[PDB]
Write a protein that binds this DNA or RNA. Sequence first.
RNA 1: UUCUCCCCGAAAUGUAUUGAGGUACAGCCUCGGAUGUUGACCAUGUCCUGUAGAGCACUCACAAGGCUA
Length: 69
Amino acid sequence: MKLHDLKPTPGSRKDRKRVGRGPGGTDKTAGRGHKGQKSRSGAGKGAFFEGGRSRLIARLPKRGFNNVG
RNA sequence: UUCUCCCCGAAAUGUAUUGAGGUACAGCCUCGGAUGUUGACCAUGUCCUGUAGAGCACUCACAAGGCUA
Ligand SMILES: [Mg+2]
Ligand SMILES: [Mg+2]
Ligand SMILES: [Mg+2]
Ligand SMILES: [Mg+2]
Ligand SMILES: [Mg+2]
Ligand SMILES: [Mg+2]
Ligand SMILES: [Mg+2]
Ligand SMILES: [Mg+2]
Ligand SMILES: [Mg+2]
Ligand SMILES: [Mg+2]
Ligand SMILES: [Mg+2]
């Protein structure tokens, strides 16, 4: 058939965010707002009072059956 | 921190922080889905309040006389 007339399903393919690159969209700061937002990123489940700091009740093992309703 | 036009559009508040020009959560923005008038204004009904004013009935302050250990 027409290898030139292969067409990807509309949708599916979508273009990448090219970030820097102009006051036509997402200019100077690259979607980042003028901040203490700077390259070498550091943290993901942390603030400093942590509060995932509730207490624990603990067993080690487990074992279980395959189910056949 | 570099190419274009189109649509919407904020925050500089709260609480926490060896925290205070940083950060977490919330708040406020946008997008898609769901409901689908529950939103907005203004009206009537109803309930709550101690400010403006005022007043000395209590507390404190206080002006001229009277009576008076
Ligand atoms: Mg864009
Ligand atoms: Mg800068
Ligand atoms: Mg670096
Ligand atoms: Mg507009
Ligand atoms: Mg507190
Ligand atoms: Mg701060
Ligand atoms: Mg947030
Ligand atoms: Mg929506
Ligand atoms: Mg409603
Ligand atoms: Mg209504
Ligand atoms: Mg008054």
